[PDB]
Amino acid sequence: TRKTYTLTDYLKNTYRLKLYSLRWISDHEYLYKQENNILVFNAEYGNSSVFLENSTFDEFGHSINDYSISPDGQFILLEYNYVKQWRHSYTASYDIYDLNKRQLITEERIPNNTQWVTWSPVGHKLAYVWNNDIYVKIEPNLPSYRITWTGKEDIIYNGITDWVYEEEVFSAYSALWWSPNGTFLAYAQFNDTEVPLIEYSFYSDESLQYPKTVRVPYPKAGAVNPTVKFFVVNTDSLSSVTNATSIQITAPASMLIGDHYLCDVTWATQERISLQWLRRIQNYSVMDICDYDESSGRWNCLVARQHIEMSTTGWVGRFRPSEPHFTLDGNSFYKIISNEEGYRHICYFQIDKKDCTFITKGTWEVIGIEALTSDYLYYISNEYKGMPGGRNLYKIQLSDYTKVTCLSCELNPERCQYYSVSFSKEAKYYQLRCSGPGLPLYTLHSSVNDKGLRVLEDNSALDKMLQNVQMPSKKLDFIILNETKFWYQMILPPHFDKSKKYPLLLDVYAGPCSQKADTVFRLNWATYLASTENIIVASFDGRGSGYQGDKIMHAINRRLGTFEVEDQIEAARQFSKMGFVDNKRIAIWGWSYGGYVTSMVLGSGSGVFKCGIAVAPVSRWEYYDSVYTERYMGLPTPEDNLDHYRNSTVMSRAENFKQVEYLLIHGTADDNVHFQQSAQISKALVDVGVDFQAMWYTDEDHGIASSTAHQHIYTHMSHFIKQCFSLP
Amino acid sequence: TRKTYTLTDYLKNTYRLKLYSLRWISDHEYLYKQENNILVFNAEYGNSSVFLENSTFDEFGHSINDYSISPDGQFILLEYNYVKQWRHSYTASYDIYDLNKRQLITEERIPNNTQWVTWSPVGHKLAYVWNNDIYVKIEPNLPSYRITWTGKEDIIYNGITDWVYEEEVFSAYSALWWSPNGTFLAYAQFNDTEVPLIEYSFYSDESLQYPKTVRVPYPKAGAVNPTVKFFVVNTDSLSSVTNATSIQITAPASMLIGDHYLCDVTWATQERISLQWLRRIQNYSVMDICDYDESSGRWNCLVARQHIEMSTTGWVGRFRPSEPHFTLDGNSFYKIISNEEGYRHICYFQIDKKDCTFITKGTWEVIGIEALTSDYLYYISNEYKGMPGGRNLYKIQLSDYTKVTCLSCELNPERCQYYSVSFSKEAKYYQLRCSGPGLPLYTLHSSVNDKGLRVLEDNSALDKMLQNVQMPSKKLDFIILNETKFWYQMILPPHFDKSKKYPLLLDVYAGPCSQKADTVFRLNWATYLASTENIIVASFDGRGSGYQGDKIMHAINRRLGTFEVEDQIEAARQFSKMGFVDNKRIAIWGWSYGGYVTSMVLGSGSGVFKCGIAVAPVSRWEYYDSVYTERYMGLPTPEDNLDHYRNSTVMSRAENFKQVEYLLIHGTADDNVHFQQSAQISKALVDVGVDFQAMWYTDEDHGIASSTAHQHIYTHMSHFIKQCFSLP
Ligand SMILES: *[C@@H]1O[C@H](CO)[C@@H](O[C@@H]2O[C@H](CO)[C@@H](O)[C@H](O)[C@H]2NC(C)=O)[C@H](O)[C@H]1NC(C)=O
Ligand SMILES: *[C@@H]1O[C@H](CO)[C@@H](O[C@@H]2O[C@H](CO)[C@@H](O)[C@H](O)[C@H]2NC(C)=O)[C@H](O)[C@H]1NC(C)=O
Ligand SMILES: *[C@@H]1O[C@H](CO)[C@@H](O[C@@H]2O[C@H](CO)[C@@H](O)[C@H](O)[C@H]2NC(C)=O)[C@H](O)[C@H]1NC(C)=O
Ligand SMILES: *[C@@H]1O[C@H](CO)[C@@H](O[C@@H]2O[C@H](CO)[C@@H](O)[C@H](O)[C@H]2NC(C)=O)[C@H](O)[C@H]1NC(C)=O
Ligand SMILES: *[C@@H]1O[C@H](CO)[C@@H](O[C@@H]2O[C@H](CO)[C@@H](O)[C@H](O)[C@H]2NC(C)=O)[C@H](O)[C@H]1NC(C)=O
Ligand SMILES: *[C@@H]1O[C@H](CO)[C@@H](O[C@@H]2O[C@H](CO)[C@@H](O)[C@H](O)[C@H]2NC(C)=O)[C@H](O)[C@H]1NC(C)=O
Ligand SMILES: *[C@@H]1O[C@H](CO)[C@@H](O[C@@H]2O[C@H](CO)[C@@H](O)[C@H](O)[C@H]2NC(C)=O)[C@H](O)[C@H]1NC(C)=O
Ligand SMILES: *[C@@H]1O[C@H](CO)[C@@H](O[C@H]2O[C@H](CO)[C@@H](O)[C@H](O)[C@H]2NC(C)=O)[C@H](O)[C@H]1NC(C)=O
Ligand SMILES: *[C@@H]1O[C@H](CO)[C@@H](O[C@H]2O[C@H](CO)[C@@H](O)[C@H](O)[C@H]2NC(C)=O)[C@H](O)[C@H]1NC(C)=O
Ligand SMILES: N[C@H]1Cn2c(nc3cnccc32)C[C@@H]1c1cc(F)c(F)cc1F
Ligand SMILES: N[C@H]1Cn2c(nc3cnccc32)C[C@@H]1c1cc(F)c(F)cc1F
Ligand SMILES: *[C@@H]1O[C@H](CO)[C@@H](O)[C@H](O)[C@H]1NC(C)=O
Ligand SMILES: *[C@@H]1O[C@H](CO)[C@@H](O)[C@H](O)[C@H]1NC(C)=O
Ligand SMILES: *[C@@H]1O[C@H](CO)[C@@H](O)[C@H](O)[C@H]1NC(C)=O
Ligand SMILES: *[C@H]1O[C@H](CO)[C@@H](O)[C@H](O)[C@H]1NC(C)=O
Ligand code: NA
């Protein structure tokens, strides 16, 4: 009798997915790490050489966290002393190694505690941020040029984002953008002077006698937001003038009338940059397209080139307005936008014409534009088989939009329904990454004839291992509610018997534009629960969920904590109707937005769920950050949406928790969903005399991701679910 | 069949103990609040009159928290807008009502947010502290004289204590001391300039968008302490034109050489004050006796009148050097000190002689000196029947120390073995308060022939109610360890059957000088556990416990977390061998110091305990306050006691928790034992992969005493214990 997939299997990673992470360094070569060597591969033929021997930095004296080769291949940037900050931010030390001289550079070193560093896109210039100011090095061994003097910790951020811009706008710490050949350096400056601070304790190692108070500028909903300015400096002038001028590009008048955000920066040509701005009320966005004026040294944005993007039903974009993809001449661009039927499709714009032309259409959506050549646009969508949870690569002929080829659909239709892609520098080659429903499969292809060159990684090692394991299966299907298809997945125990009644765990996220029903292969907690504990683990994408049109996505506009919550309850009712679910043993759990929905469900009075677990939940929208929250909720003012902000809190449902078993879990150093949010849930439950289970994680953040804390939380939750389901 | 004492009975106070809280106002009369009316009683005859009608303040407009009648009976101070601070500190608003003219004083009112107020001991002067400064009013309707001008929040404290002096030295917020007839006002001034601050979050009501950070000057072990100065002001020579002159009395040279504390202030006569100072290494204390010089207006403390009190085996005093009790002329005094056998007895001192004479002796201790006349000294001791956990009132004939009379031992030997006492102004009368083993009993007596005048309150109402309840019993007894007796108590289930096996919960405190085995009648959580759940609740007084001599008490000197922890394990081991204890079901619990011991016991690897609960535990001594911790531990420096500080932590025992069920509980707003302490425990257990149960209480402090949190904690703990013991 084959073993099952156990909790220790999951926690110890005994069954490991192999990846194939390559780095394109040109149109036909990529870098690959094998046995701590860096190998260079020829894409066409598959032959390789040692780029950098594993032993090169044995006497470096530091463990190297990561590396970055300069575009011209002359230098390598070595990252060490890595210290994580938020989701994307960190600080580190850096050395530069001269590849031709086979020597480490010892003069004019990048300082310690550097916040961000990037090569220019061509050559070997560097820009870096240190103590919140921008510096540029033209040559790796030569003195830096200081670009800004206003940097001030927690106050003025030059070339890097503050907390909210990092998390909600740019999904990145970096706020600088080199022009295509590296002449210009564009950057944003954030001013957080009047932004309130979140403060929480950090306990550190037990040696620390007094806890530290962490203080972060963080605008909660309706609070004072950071302000932003945008600048461009000519780096080619740096060695000729004592103090090169950063030229400001100001937001349009339609943005300056009130609070606003900078939400996109994309260079079009060597002398043309596009910027998108978003009103604090996030249903109106403006793109400016700005040209360098050689005679004046200024940047001018013609109103004839300004593009408006607005929504009447919701916010703009999935999580932000989409990025433009410019044709080589910079005179036109492609952008994903919601069409008249509410489906996101590719629109083609001339820079000085306001009406665009849709080049794709249908009741499905484009997920991303991946590459653009003179003859073809390459994009990912969920068109194939009308499955919103599948992903395939397509190629559209620019001279003939009727000519659309699916590049991945039929490669291995049984094994592979969810692709992402990695193109070489001028799209001569592409790596396809299949992530399910079978084992991930990595392959290489030539763009010239769309032929498969070779399999890079097929996970045959893991396949072999898993043959000895009673693995669960996955069902992906839909139910019809109010004449609309809503998709669900079930992780089903091995030897699933439809004539039996199984306990069911509803695994919930359900945030706006979320997707929890898909074709991705996962080895996770659900695998164990199904394989070992014979629990069905289900997920459902109801109103508010993504990739299915605006009618579904915008259904929760200004009304978080309503339809997406009800639809999870209704999903559980529907799963009972299916006949293989023990109605006495239905649980629900979720993390983050999923913790909020879980708590709302457990507090609803539905009687459907026996028990549930919320991990790091939102409990009240006024506690969460402005950019994310206001996107869906508008402002917490009597004139806008305060009534709904107050009506959608977990705390107001406290009395209903008498009907359920609840486990509430939060990390004490969560900078994102503050521990405050669960502190207020627990206090409300205490106040109405409701017993529940609790667990804090000392010094853990929103990920609760440290090795020991990760193992501890899943161990704790497993005991809780098993007790609830009367499982020995 | 009759009901049991249930968890709801404990939580809703179904069975209430009656008290008789009186306030002596003279040698012959006392005040007693009855039906919200203040009555005055004649002690000799027990007749009364209405002193102040309940309805006098019907239109007052505020809920009155408390009252204080001036010593001359002419005024009543009305306390309202009460806002708690720490254990003893609070602020309030005050009004004064003139009892003769039947009117509120509206002129020159005491300000809002007053920190401390006190009548002079004679007449009706007032001293109050507001915004950290001292003010005096000679008449309730006249303007105040500002005494000090240096008061500064969290920095300079005039006439009030800082956090550590409040909690650890004076057990009071007040640092003001009127002379016996009100001529002089003595006060201390604390300076916390370089004391580090503990910082923690306070979440407040749900409406508060950003948590507040509370910051309290709090010296952890080894940290910079507050400094202190002492002053005396003449309140009879205050002027409206000139600022008051305060006369400083400086500490002796033997204190000024390093860190020290002011630990006692006791007026001897109208012109003589005593102070005791304590070294930061709390085994050396010095009393100065200081006399007013009418010609210089200075206070001189003759060196011939200095009294040194030191310890070679531990610290000085039970929790601080004891208070002196001066004779009428103030030329001599009585003080409890540890004799050559290490038992605390009354010593008689002449103000200018070095040697004192012990007037009591034996293998038992004096608990307190209660009254002094020219003929008798009245004291409480545990001499009777050699029971260290019993308390009785004695008088000793000052002309013949062989003549000692027990005044309470034989009044009701079965019901009453634990007394406290309240004497009238010149000891003409005394109220005895019996608190166990039977129901509390309040009686009034006259000193001249020790007549038992009358019964004030016999709790006969409660007795009648309890007849219909299956109440537990209490066994008080001893075990021998190493030729020494150590006392324990057991709360035994109703109808206790010594041929049955009961589960046993060990209820622990075990701090230095603690006593958990006594003759006191209590209605508490243990009553419920025994009465309803049939659990034996045991407590044991081992090494380090009080009231049994320094051999026992000082056994843990410089070594907290050693013998007192081992002795609890040994007691349980012994209990576990008794015929009526189920050795498979032994649990341990404690709060505060008891939570530390519980945690150290559970991390000991003993195997004796199935489960335990730690509430607000200390986890590492370097996290607790200086005055308490260093008293027992010295300084956490390599040259002193750092090594023992480092190996007496809960965290180092984390691995040993693998074979026990542990519930760890802590209030997030604990200003005393910081949440930090439990935060470091949880992290240690996570780090070794030990599962446990946790509960935080949002915004609760060391008491976890709000009505809702108190009910919630005891409900949660009851579930945990019942689960542990397999109880339905
Ligand atoms: C992969 O092999 C190719 C072709 O064999 C290498 O490219 C050149 O090969 C020819 C002879 O076949 C010679 O001119 C040189 O030896 C090679 N020049 C280069 C580019 O170094 C190529 O080197 C191989 N690629 C890798 C990354 O190992
Ligand atoms: C960041 O924004 C703040 C405003 O919040 C600017 O601070 C003000 O500067 C002016 C001078 O121009 C002063 O008169 C005000 O007193 C300041 N106000 C506040 C609230 O501090 C600040 O100059 C901005 N910094 C940068 C570099 O843009
Ligand atoms: C380089 O030029 C910038 C921009 O003119 C200078 O920044 C100004 O510095 C002065 C005085 O130090 C301030 O009053 C201005 O508010 C600053 N403006 C900006 C945009 O930051 C900078 O000081 C110059 N650096 C050098 C070396 O001269
Ligand atoms: C990168 O692009 C920039 C901007 O177009 C080039 O700089 C210009 O070069 C032209 C010559 O063709 C001159 O007319 C201008 O004076 C330059 N403009 C600026 C703003 O400096 C630059 O030469 C390009 N770099 C490379 C390596 O090709
Ligand atoms: C204590 O506080 C109250 C309220 O602030 C004071 O009451 C006065 O009367 C009303 C509200 O009851 C306010 O408008 C006034 O500002 C208050 N003060 C004045 C000027 O009379 C009260 O005075 C305060 N008590 C003292 C002694 O300061
Ligand atoms: C309380 O005691 C003080 C101090 O002994 C008394 O003040 C003294 O009174 C006598 C007059 O009888 C004067 O000769 C002294 O000069 C006073 N001394 C000081 C220090 O002021 C005071 O009279 C007593 N008051 C009461 C209420 O009995
Ligand atoms: C008060 O206690 C201290 C600490 O126990 C005693 O001072 C010395 O402490 C150091 C280590 O901290 C040791 O090296 C010495 O052995 C201690 N002194 C002795 C006993 O010689 C100090 O002696 C105590 N004071 C009194 C009055 O007994
Ligand atoms: C208790 O009883 C005595 C009488 O036995 C009360 O009477 C004394 O005081 C009264 C007013 O203060 C006078 O009216 C009496 O004349 C006086 N009697 C004597 C001679 O002592 C006394 O007040 C009573 N006490 C109380 C508090 O009511
Ligand atoms: C309270 O104590 C502080 C010392 O902690 C006193 O300040 C002194 O120490 C300062 C450094 O903090 C020195 O700069 C000064 O010499 C000294 N005094 C001054 C001017 O601050 C402080 O005076 C004390 N306050 C009172 C009222 O006694
Ligand atoms: N802060 C948000 C940022 N975010 C999220 N999805 C994204 C997709 N793309 C960009 C930013 C994105 C959820 C994420 C997020 C949402 C929450 F509601 C929450 F409680 C905690 C979170 F981390
Ligand atoms: N801070 C201490 C003050 N204290 C204690 N007993 C006393 C007796 N007399 C004066 C102060 C006294 C225990 C008390 C105390 C001791 C502790 F170890 C603890 F963790 C928490 C506490 F509150
Ligand atoms: C980084 O820090 C270390 C330790 O302080 C130091 O030796 C080294 O010189 C630093 N590097 C730079 C570039 O300053
Ligand atoms: C943006 O949203 C607000 C609130 O729903 C609305 O009043 C306004 O008309 C919207 N603007 C656009 C461009 O639709
Ligand atoms: C009293 O002292 C304070 C503080 O030093 C001062 O401001 C005030 O003017 C003084 N008053 C008189 C009457 O001297
Ligand atoms: C260098 O990498 C590893 C040591 O980290 C070693 O196993 C490997 O054999 C080396 N590379 C080569 C030349 O294969
Ligand atoms: Na009597």
XYZ file of N, CA and C in Angstrom, chain A residues 196-201 203-211 213 215 218-223 620 622-623 649 651-652 664-666 668 675-676 678-680 682-683 685-699 708-709 712 715-716 719, chain B residues 196-201 203-211 213 215 218-223 620 622-623 649 651-652 664-666 668 675-676 678-680 682-683 685-687 689-699 708-709 712 715-716 719:
363
model
N 0.624 59.600 8.040
C 0.734 59.056 9.387
C 1.587 57.782 9.444
N 2.144 57.509 10.619
C 2.966 56.312 10.833
C 2.191 55.183 11.491
N 2.346 53.972 10.962
C 1.974 52.790 11.729
C 3.148 52.497 12.658
N 2.844 52.172 13.908
C 3.879 51.840 14.871
C 3.533 50.486 15.478
N 4.528 49.612 15.568
C 4.337 48.308 16.215
C 5.677 47.866 16.795
N 5.632 46.934 17.745
C 6.817 46.450 18.414
C 7.478 45.343 17.611
N 10.428 42.553 18.593
C 11.069 41.995 19.773
C 12.518 41.570 19.558
N 12.823 41.107 18.341
C 14.173 40.700 17.934
C 14.660 39.469 18.704
N 15.960 39.198 18.637
C 16.540 38.097 19.400
C 16.322 38.366 20.886
N 16.339 37.313 21.686
C 16.030 37.453 23.103
C 17.035 38.337 23.864
N 18.232 38.512 23.289
C 19.273 39.401 23.841
C 18.811 40.859 23.927
N 17.894 41.268 23.057
C 17.429 42.659 23.051
C 16.573 42.950 24.293
N 17.050 43.864 25.141
C 16.399 44.131 26.444
C 15.054 44.873 26.310
N 15.033 45.926 25.495
C 13.809 46.701 25.223
C 13.361 46.460 23.804
N 12.065 46.138 23.602
C 11.592 45.988 22.229
C 11.740 47.273 21.424
N 10.406 49.883 18.531
C 9.186 50.311 17.868
C 9.481 50.603 16.406
N 8.401 52.082 12.927
C 7.539 53.193 12.536
C 7.629 53.380 11.026
N 2.493 55.080 6.374
C 1.505 54.152 5.851
C 0.179 54.872 5.902
N -0.368 55.237 4.730
C -1.676 55.880 4.735
C -2.794 54.827 4.782
N -3.562 54.830 5.862
C -4.771 54.001 5.961
C -5.877 54.694 5.156
N -6.988 54.003 4.916
C -8.036 54.538 4.042
C -8.513 55.919 4.466
N -8.489 56.858 3.522
C -8.935 58.229 3.753
C -7.884 59.143 4.363
N -6.733 58.586 4.745
C -5.676 59.379 5.395
C -4.858 60.209 4.388
N -11.444 45.473 9.159
C -12.139 46.752 9.002
C -11.401 47.544 7.929
N -11.119 50.642 7.047
C -10.414 51.851 7.492
C -9.007 51.568 8.048
N -8.716 50.311 8.370
C -7.368 49.924 8.838
C -6.376 49.594 7.716
N -17.474 45.384 8.517
C -16.372 45.013 9.405
C -16.659 43.635 9.976
N -15.906 42.855 13.100
C -16.281 43.100 14.505
C -17.794 43.186 14.718
N -18.509 43.763 13.749
C -19.978 43.920 13.866
C -20.733 42.597 13.831
N -7.975 32.190 15.001
C -7.495 33.476 14.515
C -5.980 33.559 14.673
N -5.271 33.869 13.591
C -3.800 33.810 13.601
C -3.221 35.065 12.955
N -2.185 35.652 13.551
C -1.597 36.876 12.975
C -0.118 36.996 13.400
N 2.999 39.309 14.557
C 3.013 40.571 15.306
C 3.741 41.705 14.552
N -1.269 43.930 12.867
C -1.748 43.061 13.952
C -2.995 43.670 14.609
N -3.030 45.003 14.679
C -4.255 45.770 15.012
C -5.569 45.150 14.516
N -6.455 42.015 13.757
C -6.862 40.857 14.584
C -7.017 41.179 16.077
N -6.276 42.175 16.560
C -6.420 42.658 17.932
C -7.831 43.185 18.120
N -8.379 43.793 17.076
C -9.753 44.314 17.176
C -10.798 43.213 17.032
N -10.349 40.017 18.132
C -10.326 39.301 19.410
C -11.055 40.085 20.501
N -10.845 41.401 20.540
C -11.480 42.243 21.570
C -13.009 42.248 21.424
N -14.797 39.816 20.082
C -15.225 38.473 20.498
C -15.223 38.310 22.018
N -14.170 38.784 22.675
C -14.134 38.804 24.142
C -15.343 39.575 24.693
N -15.627 40.730 24.087
C -16.676 41.616 24.572
C -18.094 41.042 24.517
N -18.351 40.105 23.606
C -19.656 39.418 23.505
C -19.617 38.009 24.092
N -18.488 37.652 24.704
C -18.360 36.381 25.418
C -18.267 35.171 24.504
N -17.538 35.315 23.400
C -17.346 34.219 22.457
C -15.975 33.554 22.654
N -15.967 32.245 22.902
C -14.712 31.502 22.962
C -14.193 31.169 21.568
N -12.882 31.284 21.405
C -12.227 30.995 20.132
C -10.774 30.616 20.416
N -10.085 30.143 19.387
C -8.665 29.806 19.483
C -7.826 30.895 18.820
N -6.624 31.113 19.343
C -5.781 32.192 18.870
C -4.325 31.738 18.788
N -3.562 32.385 17.917
C -2.118 32.164 17.872
C -1.491 33.404 17.270
N -0.567 34.029 17.990
C 0.258 35.111 17.417
C 1.596 34.491 16.975
N 2.253 35.116 15.988
C 3.604 34.696 15.565
C 4.559 35.869 15.773
N 5.397 35.749 16.798
C 6.327 36.821 17.182
C 7.259 37.182 16.023
N 7.254 38.457 15.634
C 8.191 39.027 14.655
C 8.001 38.510 13.223
N 10.766 28.086 10.430
C 10.184 27.525 11.661
C 8.722 27.957 11.846
N 8.414 29.211 11.541
C 7.041 29.703 11.724
C 6.085 29.095 10.704
N 5.319 25.705 11.886
C 4.520 25.773 13.118
C 3.060 26.088 12.803
N 1.281 23.131 11.067
C 1.130 22.103 12.095
C -0.056 22.453 13.012
N -0.106 23.704 13.457
C -1.186 24.172 14.334
C -2.560 24.099 13.654
N -3.880 20.372 13.252
C -4.512 19.885 14.481
C -5.927 20.438 14.624
N 15.287 54.415 30.464
C 14.758 54.079 29.140
C 13.251 53.841 29.216
N 12.577 53.966 28.082
C 11.132 53.786 28.040
C 10.774 52.433 27.422
N 9.849 51.728 28.063
C 9.156 50.621 27.420
C 8.073 51.218 26.514
N 7.970 50.685 25.298
C 6.981 51.133 24.329
C 6.141 49.924 23.906
N 4.830 50.120 23.836
C 3.909 49.073 23.383
C 2.667 49.728 22.782
N 1.981 48.971 21.926
C 0.817 49.448 21.220
C -0.426 49.392 22.105
N -4.569 49.641 21.318
C -5.429 49.619 20.132
C -6.672 50.491 20.283
N -7.170 50.567 21.518
C -8.326 51.397 21.878
C -9.602 50.875 21.229
N -10.633 51.710 21.194
C -11.873 51.344 20.549
C -11.631 51.173 19.050
N -12.523 50.413 18.429
C -12.479 50.120 17.007
C -12.385 51.376 16.126
N -12.987 52.474 16.592
C -12.975 53.757 15.895
C -11.576 54.330 15.655
N -10.594 53.948 16.462
C -9.244 54.530 16.338
C -8.494 53.903 15.149
N -8.176 54.726 14.158
C -7.636 54.236 12.882
C -6.195 53.722 13.036
N -5.367 54.474 13.768
C -3.979 54.097 14.028
C -3.766 53.781 15.503
N -3.157 52.610 15.817
C -2.866 52.315 17.221
C -1.936 53.365 17.828
N 1.058 54.381 20.542
C 2.201 53.774 21.211
C 2.301 54.383 22.611
N 4.340 54.937 25.997
C 5.763 55.031 26.340
C 5.871 55.337 27.831
N 10.753 53.097 32.444
C 10.735 51.803 33.135
C 12.137 51.241 33.047
N 12.840 51.160 34.182
C 14.194 50.603 34.167
C 14.136 49.077 34.287
N 14.557 48.385 33.231
C 14.701 46.934 33.284
C 16.001 46.605 34.045
N 16.194 45.345 34.416
C 17.361 44.967 35.234
C 18.690 45.482 34.661
N 19.454 46.184 35.492
C 20.759 46.715 35.081
C 20.734 48.054 34.365
N 19.537 48.565 34.054
C 19.392 49.807 33.276
C 19.531 51.048 34.171
N 12.470 35.994 31.337
C 13.913 36.275 31.355
C 14.073 37.492 32.267
N 16.238 39.812 32.810
C 16.678 41.064 32.202
C 15.505 41.863 31.596
N 14.348 41.229 31.432
C 13.141 41.932 30.938
C 12.293 42.578 32.043
N 16.306 31.434 32.175
C 15.246 31.884 31.289
C 14.334 30.709 30.907
N 13.026 30.514 27.804
C 13.416 30.215 26.405
C 14.422 29.063 26.247
N 15.396 28.968 27.164
C 16.457 27.943 27.065
C 15.919 26.527 27.275
N -0.295 29.475 26.837
C 0.425 30.712 27.167
C -0.515 31.900 26.893
N -0.711 32.762 27.910
C -1.697 33.848 27.893
C -1.061 35.171 28.370
N -1.351 36.277 27.682
C -0.753 37.582 28.038
C -1.581 38.742 27.504
N -1.899 42.409 25.967
C -1.042 43.232 25.091
C -0.618 44.575 25.674
N 4.433 42.298 27.361
C 4.001 41.242 26.426
C 5.240 40.591 25.781
N 6.246 41.418 25.500
C 7.598 40.953 25.165
C 7.991 39.606 25.795
N 6.264 37.010 26.956
C 5.570 35.867 26.318
C 5.876 35.783 24.823
N 6.120 36.939 24.203
C 6.489 36.984 22.786
C 7.809 36.245 22.560
N 8.732 36.357 23.512
C 9.998 35.620 23.413
C 9.834 34.098 23.711
N 7.002 32.310 22.953
C 6.356 31.719 21.785
C 7.353 31.511 20.666
N 8.247 32.486 20.479
C 9.255 32.412 19.415
C 10.241 31.253 19.630
N 9.629 28.432 21.312
C 8.885 27.190 21.069
C 8.669 26.944 19.572
N 8.355 28.014 18.835
C 8.277 27.922 17.374
C 9.622 27.456 16.819
N 10.710 28.042 17.328
C 12.054 27.749 16.831
C 12.486 26.286 17.019
N 10.078 23.822 17.135
C 8.972 23.019 16.607
C 8.086 22.346 17.648
N 7.784 23.064 18.732
C 6.871 22.578 19.760
C 5.509 23.243 19.581
N 4.444 22.441 19.501
C 3.104 22.995 19.384
C 2.616 23.408 20.775
N 1.818 24.472 20.831
C 1.228 24.933 22.094
C 0.001 25.772 21.769
N -0.704 26.176 22.821
C -1.938 26.966 22.735
C -1.626 28.361 23.237
N -2.228 29.366 22.613
C -1.961 30.768 22.969
C -3.245 31.576 23.044
N -3.224 32.623 23.858
C -4.282 33.620 23.825
C -3.697 34.984 24.198
N -3.844 35.979 23.328
C -3.530 37.361 23.730
C -4.842 38.019 24.151
N -4.772 39.021 25.035
C -5.943 39.833 25.403
C -5.657 41.288 25.030
N -6.302 41.738 23.958
C -6.086 43.076 23.444
C -6.400 44.106 24.523
N -5.407 44.965 24.763
C -5.498 46.150 25.632
C -5.678 45.840 27.116
N -15.272 41.697 30.927
C -15.364 40.747 29.812
C -14.106 39.858 29.661
N -12.918 40.444 29.746
C -11.676 39.653 29.657
C -11.517 38.637 30.791
N -13.736 35.766 30.007
C -13.165 35.066 28.858
C -11.942 34.215 29.208
N -12.959 31.210 31.359
C -13.695 30.280 30.495
C -12.714 29.486 29.615
N -11.747 30.185 29.021
C -10.786 29.548 28.108
C -9.880 28.549 28.870
N -11.878 25.287 29.837
C -11.896 24.381 28.687
C -10.580 23.610 28.571
